[PDB]
Amino acid sequence: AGVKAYELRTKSKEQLASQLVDLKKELAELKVQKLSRPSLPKIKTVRKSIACVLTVINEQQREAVRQLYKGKKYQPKDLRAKKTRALRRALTKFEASQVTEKQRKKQIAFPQRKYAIKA
């Protein structure tokens, strides 16, 4: 058994919140029954369903915030790209390709040429 992530993505936050509470109630009563029975493997599928519901709720809330900060130059650090510490401090593509006006004139005037030794 267990819930399906793609099915949970088609409902509002209110429905997800209510379904989370019901799963928690079902988990609580199964723990009571575990004390009297030699085994109860059904408790596993309930725990995974709670994890799946929490995952879908988090991805909906995080997606909403990305729309709020869309286009702005400052965004929360958890919504920024991870990469590495050294990669985030490196010069951007625009900064690394900057040249002075003096050097730009030289590059246009005398670029590397294409030639061959035939005749």
Partner: protein, 149 residues
Amino acid sequence: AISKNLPILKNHFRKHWQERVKVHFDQAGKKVSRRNARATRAAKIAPRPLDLLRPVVRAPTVKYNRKVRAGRGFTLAEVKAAGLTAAYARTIGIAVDHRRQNRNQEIFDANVQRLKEYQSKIIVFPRNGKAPEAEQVLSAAATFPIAQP
């Protein structure tokens, strides 16, 4: 530790020499790497000859002054006598050395002749981008060998 009629030896092994022993096990491997690097550079760069034209100079010292060899680059006066500028010469595959001077007319004439022959045996493609395909000669030094006068 001195006995018998033997030469005096001067083997310098009183330091921790075993920590600094370099055995060239990769001699064959490095040759493969160098050949791969030359092959990939020739394909990558251009149909260009993979090396720059060099002038002929006189070796210094009384022991070696009887022979001529390849120098670093053509002088500013040599390239000027050939009808081109130093900046343009570098982009066509001519090495230019600004710190070498000309005092020998024979050497100056020989280097001018080399520049003349080089310009007549190359094709400079236009900057438009047509670039007709041409056969790539991998060695400009082999095309223009240096001969003892």
